[PDB]
């Protein structure tokens, strides 16, 4: 896997920044999956949500990574993968209704990000966007998870969404 290796830098740099932590996930089938996560020993925060850690596996209609990655999918695609997987309620926010799931996917291809709040597990905010290779396909997504009483959707906008999508654009020419 030549994704981990190059990234592992990178998601540290956003790390010692923000002091959140960063995952890189790619899609498989219906869940989303990191291949890597940053990790800065003398300030690791252990008291992060699930979800970053390898082999973690997540819903992909409920979280910011998977609803990224389901957005770059042709819109039948999207369509049986609906009517394959379902979209089931997991806390009272997740999206379960395909016509608001297909405009939230439509919105998200258009906007290269996805905040999601609370949406798989009650307390969690998320944002996400691409990754990109040199030739234009999504190939994962980047993303930030943390506690709703840790940081404001204010901050995860203004502050870590800039540096999430310069990450992605230098991450572009090397994977």
């Given at each position: 896997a030549h994704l981990p290796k190059v990234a592992q830098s990178f998601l540290n740099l956003l790390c010692a920044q923000t002091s959140l932590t960063f995952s890189i996930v790619v899609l498989d089938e219906h869940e989303v999956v990191p291949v890597a996560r940053s990790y800065l020993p003398q300030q690791d925060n252990r008291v992060s949500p699930y979800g970053m850690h390898l082999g973690n596996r997540l819903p992909a209609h409920a979280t910011s990574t998977g609803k990224v990655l389901l957005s770059v999918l042709d819109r039948e695609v999207q369509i049986e993968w609906i009517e394959k997987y379902g979209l089931k309620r997991l806390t009272p926010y997740t999206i379960t209704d395909e016509?608001?799931?297909l405009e939230t996917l439509d919105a998200v291809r258009q906007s290269d990000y996805c905040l999601s709040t609370e949406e798989h597990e009650l307390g969690v905010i998320a944002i996400a966007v691409p990754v990109l290779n040199a030739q234009g396909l999504t190939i994962a997504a980047l993303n930030c998870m943390s506690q709703?009483?840790?940081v404001q959707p204010q901050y995860l906008?203004?502050?870590v969404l800039p540096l999430l999508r310069n990450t992605a654009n230098e991450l572009?020419?090397?994977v």
């Open positions: 016509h608001t799931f709703t009483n840790r906008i203004d502050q572009r020419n090397l």
